[PDB]
Each structure stands twice: as C-alpha cells, then as structure tokens.
Amino acid sequence: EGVLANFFNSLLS
Amino acid sequence: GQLVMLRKAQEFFQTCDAEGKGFIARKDMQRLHKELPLSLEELEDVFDALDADGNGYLTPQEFTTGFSHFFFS
Ligand SMILES: [Ca+2]
C-alpha cells in the first residue's frame, strides 16, 4: 500500500 | 474525478505494457527498475499487490483498480 504509493508517485514524475 | 484517474491508468498501463501485449507480466515489472527508482524487490511487491487473482498476469482492470484505490486517498 506504501509501495504502491511509491510506484505510482514515481510514475507521476 | 474518475475520468482523470482512468486517463492516468491508461497512461501507466501503457508504460508497463510497452510491448503491446494487453497485460503486464512479472517481467515487465522488472525492466521498470531501469526507468524508475525502486528496487526489483519493491517492484514484485507492487506486482503482487496488484494481481488480485494471482494469475501472475496483470490485467488493465487489475491495474486500473489498484491505481484508483491510490488516487483516492
Ligand atoms: Ca491477474
């Protein structure tokens, strides 16, 4: 759930 | 708000499934290590979080569903 945020937040940069 | 989400899930589904297969496999999630800053170890965690049915296959609906849980917190 935090590793999804990581992965999505990273996709957003 | 749901249309903006889907516009991103498509963008990001396309990015993982760059080969045009129609799904994301456990090895598309590895070549991301070269493009994103995460360990392969995290990537499979992502993968594993996102494959709800455990096919070892990531579908668009599985991909979109995950992103939507995220997009909305
Ligand atoms: Ca699946």
Residue numbers in the entry:
A (entry chain F): 441 to 453
B (entry chain E): 47 to 119
What did the original publication write about this model?
Dynein is activated for long-distance processive movement along microtubules through interactions with its general cofactor, dynactin, and one of many so-called “activating adaptors”. The activating adaptors (hereafter referred to as adaptors) fulfill multiple roles; they mediate key interactions that stabilize the dynein–dynactin complex, recruit cargoes, and regulate dynein’s activity and processive motility. Here, we structurally and biochemically characterize the interactions of LIC1 with two adaptors, BICD2 and CRACR2a. Crystallographic analysis shows that the LIC1–adaptor interaction has a conserved hydrophobic character, with the amphipathic LIC1 helix displaying a nearly identical conformation and its hydrophobic face embedded in a hydrophobic cleft in the three adaptor subfamilies.
A crystal structure of CRACR2a47–122 (MBP removed) in complex with LIC1433–458 was obtained at 2.66 Å resolution. The monoclinic crystals, belonging to space group P21, contain eight complexes in the asymmetric unit. The two EF-hands of CRACR2a display a canonical fold, consisting of incoming helix (helices α1 and α3), loop and exiting helix (helices α2 and α4). As indicated by the ITC titration, the structure reveals a single Ca2+-binding site. Consistent with the sequence analysis, the Ca2+ density is observed within the second EF-hand domain of all the complexes of the asymmetric unit, whereas none of the complexes displays Ca2+ density within the first EF-hand. In CRACR2a, Ca2+ is ligated by the side chains of D97, D99, N101, E108, the main-chain carbonyl oxygen of Y103 and a water molecule that is in turn coordinated by T105. Like in other members of the EF-hand family, the target-binding site consists of a hydrophobic cleft formed between the incoming and exiting helices of the two EF-hand domains. The hydrophobic face of the LIC1 helix binds in this cleft, and the same conformation is observed in all eight complexes of the asymmetric unit. Like in the complexes with the HOOK domain18 and BICD2, highly conserved, hydrophobic residues of the LIC1 helix (L444, F447, F448, and L451) insert into the hydrophobic cleft formed by the EF-hand pair of CRACR2a. We have shown here that CRACR2a is regulated by Ca2+ binding to a single site within the EF-hand pair, which in turn triggers the binding of the LIC1 helix.
